[PDB]
RNA sequence: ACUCUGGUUUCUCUUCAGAUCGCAUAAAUCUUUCGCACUAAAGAUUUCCGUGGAGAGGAACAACUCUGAGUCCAAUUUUUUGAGGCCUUGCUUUGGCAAGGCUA
């Protein structure tokens, strides 16, 4: 067995990658549940930026801490889904449309 | 060798080369047939019982063995 | 027995029957630098002896950092004993009493408490970091306490996964670590029989995160189990050093066959491990099953789906198995309680081995007189009752057996400190669950209930109605000195008794805690550092006393000294105006005070050896060299009392009548000190004329002692008094770029950098510097914040140095809330300390 | 698959008190120091009883493994993990 | 697989070696083999007749060895 | 052993040119064979199969042994049996009387 | 450290008057001049003579090949 | 080394879940606290976005990889022999047993 392969240096660098890049399997998340900049404002306030930027950093951190602190356990319940109930009745039907068409339909319906 | 794993924990009397009788609880055995017998007693002939305990006998002197008592609790 | 316990690989009946055979017991303490891997090892072993207790996939179950603050801080704070039955390489089982000790430099007292009741030491060293500050300190402490020393080079995976060194350079790094340890041991010890080398089995290599632990013998045994026909013991003797394998001749030579030939350790041990780790972390999907087939490991399908770290742990666990190399090390090179009893009695027993009780204790015979020594006190979570913990050096302790408990002041003539108590229960201590037992023979560690009432720090438990000539074991000699001082006071003065009770309880918990009540009614706690006092106050406010306690600003303890000889020879007379003493004070020679405190010299020596030592070491004539009366406030205080009274001027026989009182007066005077009620250090007191009243009714008792104390004070005050700061020794590890930032942080706090140097084989640097203790509060936080957390420092007390200013100078004006310039720091340190103590605002320099 | 359980049990007996009966009918009771895969026993502090019944004291003894009839082990070894 | 029996503690050591046919032999050990066949320096016969007979350099089959005792302290 | 080859038929070359070929003779030519065994007993019969251990199976055998009184040799008949190899002293093909 | 098989080797080098006991036969000893051994310590003895202890009749056997399973201990002269 | 389970995917239904049930983080109501309540904190309840576990039913293709289970050793150290024969005493269950002395 050779000491190192062509994917040994890269495979070690994955040990220290930030989550989820240190994983090799996992459960899919919703698109809106992934904050892409949450680890940006958790860093130190950047010196040299104008005062508005630093105040924005601190204000983001404030709501982050409040969310983490005021967090409450998700209550136990019984699975009841609205859209399954809608499809069960005879008043609704299913199809597959372009997103833009559905956006236009929702706009007109709300109007 | 299942023919003796079936006999484990059974109260076994083994006959020795010199005529010695060893009654005790069969615990373990190996390929050379060295026997592990716990709370073992030896019966010699004039009747007399000498309580010994945990005996590891070499396969050399072991001759013949027989179940005498069911496994205890 | 009869206690619901986690199921073990062994059975507790075997454990109980092992305790009787003192040749199968190993009393081991795990020690090392901070965060050097000492705790997984315990679970890394608990798991292997507890099928159901496993470590979480994403979180390590410390299982011995059982405390709250231990679990959040992730820092070892208190020693946790573990008693497990561990199999050997040959399949034999031994009972192991393991002391998991904290690695933080502030909590060294827990390490000494563990060292007292242990026969051997397993020093843990990070493979990447190397030998750090606490590793050297613990090596010194262990070889001084006469303990067998072994080394476990933990975290070897960092050489592979983090640093990615070539296997040969990893071998160089390991050899360099071993050589550094050997050099330290030879520095602190004279006899050679403590050579550490993996050829002797002294050194183990391990990576607790990935369940790797092997000596040379255990790896050779892996080879032998795979290929039957090799003798692993002789194989292991060729697996280290500059010995190369020649595959053509199938023999190991001291010369490398041709070129590009690797040493035996690299070829047979380091390269396979490198390849295993590389395969697991790089080719888990491609070429892992094939290599696992080659090694004979078969992993199930859902097992191959694990993340890389759990998969590596699992693969290495399958390949290596149990930690038999560690047990081999500790069985071969750590004495059993029966064999190690004699040095233990020689060192830690006041009666000496020669004593009749000393002999029976040195036999470690469990049918002899009871002699149990307790050094740790563990509090139940309710915080009301404590449980003493210690080893039974002789006899056998029973549950319900009345016992005689001896304190630390108990002597064979002052038998008032002893107290009869009744043992309630006995637990074989494991990290989390206590296994209750009915009796504990000699050579074992036992948790005792019912003897906690009359003991503060340590005790010796014997039997009533026998063992009349039973003395005590020496109180623990700690590595450091408690210097950082804080004052406490309840918010509501009504609940003062509650805070006093809490103070007693914390004094019981922390071995080196010193709680005292000053003259001004001020309660003072002495600690080693900021973390130490933080955790002490956390326990005090939340665990033992449920009241609110105010905390004063941290301050240090000072010492008083002189810098020349007294101008005019002082004199002081008794109120009878008959007895008169004349003394002068001069500074001691350089390096003599340290000799005195470190017991290089003892007044227990005959006058001949004292005289010859002083003559050959500090240019003292025989007259003065044999003239020593006392040795400072204690038996080893840094001050000396010398009589220069001529035989013609004063009759020496009459002087002998007042020698025994002048000694006491001088000891008390040095204990208090005239400046700010602090200890006197590095001062030599010479008596010049001692006029003695012939009538014994005039001298002796309460007339000559105060005169001696007053003359000591006055003689001290003529020669220019100075204050002394405690100086801290800081070691900082930081990357190359942050070294300048470390310099900048140090420069602001009167810091003086001694040396910076690279860490061989690591990308970091070590900066060693000296900082005044008082100019050190928040230094760790300043360093870790200015460097964005990339620099970390541990500080430990080193020595005493003179404050720049002159304490006795009224010309200096100090404002209440401004930092003072160095030219007059001493004046502030003196007057503010006097105000804190409640004394007058200034001294009255006089005769 | 290679080394039998009884040899392992004998390995466990090291350090305890053991009584040894060789084919010459000689009984050796003493502290078992070491044992090998074969019954070669290095054992100490021997109270030795001959066939006639004479008792002697002999501090160091090394018995060839081929020449042991049986070995009586201490009862606490009945709790060895290897006997489960 | 024939591991050498552990007699290094009994090296250079005066020993009494009893035999199969009630014979007994004394001398100092100088080496062995995995079959424990035993070499003796300054060997003394001292048969059951009660008279000690000295030989010197001798080598014994291990198959007839019953029991090995170190007369001198090891 | 210097010959660890799997296709090992040297044991029957022992049964053709070696000392054990004597009993293979009685296997092929079927003559009465006399056996002297360790209990001071003698066995006469016909051998059918055996191996390197010299343990063999016989048929229609007469065994005689003497008992002291003073030594009188008794005889008992056994139809078919099997002797362990190590329990023998000598093996004899009965001589040609003609 | 000195290895039995090698001792047979020098015994055949010296052609010493090697005497060998017998397994369990205390009465009968054999003397002779050794020539060779093997991995099983079977020996060839040139001028061999049986020695008893009760009759003590020295009977010459010529050259012999005493089995290694029967030897007990080799003595010189 | 020969045979018998277990599959995976998808849709629906039922129950439990204080587990970062969710590596994310809304809204409403009530109470308390001080300001003087988007620019504010605490406690509690509720609703929403949407989960895991188990169980049940439906329907689409894989069926023995995996998880299991049932299915070459005669020469010292053990299993390819130092075995058997003679003498005395106590008791003979008159077969001989027990110990010792022997010969091989
Ligand atoms: N890379 C690596 N990290 C390890 C290894 N073993 C432990 N660690 C980690 O290093 C840190 C050491 O923590 P502990 O092992 O609890 O520390 P300790 O040695 O007990 O020392 P104290 O904190 O003084 O109690 C933790 O983050 C461990 O998870 C190892 O083998 N390799």
Short mmCIF file of N, CA and C in Angstrom, two decimals, chain A residues 59-96:
data_model
loop_
_atom_site.label_atom_id
_atom_site.label_comp_id
_atom_site.label_asym_id
_atom_site.label_seq_id
_atom_site.Cartn_x
_atom_site.Cartn_y
_atom_site.Cartn_z
N UNK A 59 -25.25 44.96 16.40
CA UNK A 59 -26.69 44.78 16.44
C UNK A 59 -27.09 43.39 15.95
N UNK A 60 -26.39 42.88 14.93
CA UNK A 60 -26.63 41.50 14.50
C UNK A 60 -26.29 40.52 15.61
N UNK A 61 -25.16 40.73 16.28
CA UNK A 61 -24.78 39.86 17.39
C UNK A 61 -25.81 39.90 18.51
N UNK A 62 -26.42 41.06 18.75
CA UNK A 62 -27.41 41.17 19.81
C UNK A 62 -28.60 40.26 19.56
N UNK A 63 -29.12 40.27 18.34
CA UNK A 63 -30.27 39.43 18.03
C UNK A 63 -29.88 37.97 17.95
N UNK A 64 -28.65 37.68 17.52
CA UNK A 64 -28.16 36.30 17.57
C UNK A 64 -28.16 35.77 19.01
N UNK A 65 -27.62 36.55 19.94
CA UNK A 65 -27.57 36.13 21.34
C UNK A 65 -28.98 36.01 21.91
N UNK A 66 -29.86 36.96 21.59
CA UNK A 66 -31.23 36.89 22.09
C UNK A 66 -31.95 35.65 21.58
N UNK A 67 -31.78 35.32 20.29
CA UNK A 67 -32.37 34.10 19.76
C UNK A 67 -31.84 32.87 20.48
N UNK A 68 -30.52 32.80 20.66
CA UNK A 68 -29.95 31.62 21.31
C UNK A 68 -30.36 31.52 22.77
N UNK A 69 -30.66 32.65 23.41
CA UNK A 69 -31.00 32.67 24.83
C UNK A 69 -32.49 32.48 25.08
N UNK A 70 -33.34 33.19 24.34
CA UNK A 70 -34.78 33.07 24.47
C UNK A 70 -35.33 31.84 23.76
N UNK A 71 -34.47 30.95 23.28
CA UNK A 71 -34.93 29.78 22.55
C UNK A 71 -35.74 28.87 23.46
N UNK A 72 -36.86 28.39 22.94
CA UNK A 72 -37.74 27.49 23.66
C UNK A 72 -37.80 26.14 22.95
N UNK A 73 -37.94 25.05 23.70
CA UNK A 73 -38.04 23.72 23.08
C UNK A 73 -39.26 23.64 22.18
N UNK A 74 -39.15 22.97 21.04
CA UNK A 74 -40.33 22.77 20.17
C UNK A 74 -41.34 21.86 20.86
N UNK A 75 -42.57 22.34 20.97
CA UNK A 75 -43.60 21.62 21.72
C UNK A 75 -43.97 20.32 21.02
N UNK A 76 -44.28 19.31 21.84
CA UNK A 76 -44.76 18.04 21.32
C UNK A 76 -46.19 18.19 20.82
N UNK A 77 -46.49 17.51 19.71
CA UNK A 77 -47.80 17.63 19.08
C UNK A 77 -48.09 16.36 18.29
N UNK A 78 -49.19 16.40 17.54
CA UNK A 78 -49.60 15.31 16.66
C UNK A 78 -49.54 15.81 15.23
N UNK A 79 -48.88 15.05 14.36
CA UNK A 79 -48.68 15.48 12.98
C UNK A 79 -50.01 15.71 12.28
N UNK A 80 -50.30 16.97 11.95
CA UNK A 80 -51.43 17.32 11.11
C UNK A 80 -50.95 18.30 10.06
N UNK A 81 -51.16 17.96 8.79
CA UNK A 81 -50.65 18.75 7.68
C UNK A 81 -51.81 19.41 6.95
N UNK A 82 -51.69 20.71 6.71
CA UNK A 82 -52.78 21.46 6.08
C UNK A 82 -52.98 21.03 4.63
N UNK A 83 -51.89 20.89 3.87
CA UNK A 83 -52.03 20.66 2.44
C UNK A 83 -52.50 19.25 2.13
N UNK A 84 -52.10 18.26 2.94
CA UNK A 84 -52.67 16.93 2.79
C UNK A 84 -54.17 16.96 3.02
N UNK A 85 -54.61 17.71 4.03
CA UNK A 85 -56.04 17.87 4.28
C UNK A 85 -56.73 18.53 3.09
N UNK A 86 -56.08 19.53 2.49
CA UNK A 86 -56.65 20.18 1.31
C UNK A 86 -56.80 19.19 0.16
N UNK A 87 -55.77 18.38 -0.09
CA UNK A 87 -55.83 17.44 -1.20
C UNK A 87 -56.83 16.32 -0.93
N UNK A 88 -57.08 16.01 0.34
CA UNK A 88 -58.06 14.98 0.67
C UNK A 88 -59.45 15.37 0.20
N UNK A 89 -59.82 16.64 0.38
CA UNK A 89 -61.12 17.11 -0.07
C UNK A 89 -61.17 17.14 -1.60
N UNK A 90 -62.38 17.23 -2.13
CA UNK A 90 -62.60 17.24 -3.57
C UNK A 90 -62.46 18.62 -4.19
N UNK A 91 -62.20 19.65 -3.39
CA UNK A 91 -62.16 21.02 -3.88
C UNK A 91 -60.81 21.41 -4.46
N UNK A 92 -59.77 20.60 -4.27
CA UNK A 92 -58.44 20.94 -4.72
C UNK A 92 -57.91 19.86 -5.66
N UNK A 93 -57.02 20.26 -6.56
CA UNK A 93 -56.37 19.35 -7.48
C UNK A 93 -54.91 19.75 -7.62
N UNK A 94 -54.10 18.82 -8.10
CA UNK A 94 -52.66 19.01 -8.19
C UNK A 94 -52.22 19.05 -9.65
N UNK A 95 -51.16 19.80 -9.90
CA UNK A 95 -50.53 19.86 -11.21
C UNK A 95 -49.05 20.20 -11.00
N UNK A 96 -48.38 20.61 -12.06
CA UNK A 96 -46.98 21.01 -11.98
C UNK A 96 -46.76 22.17 -12.94
#
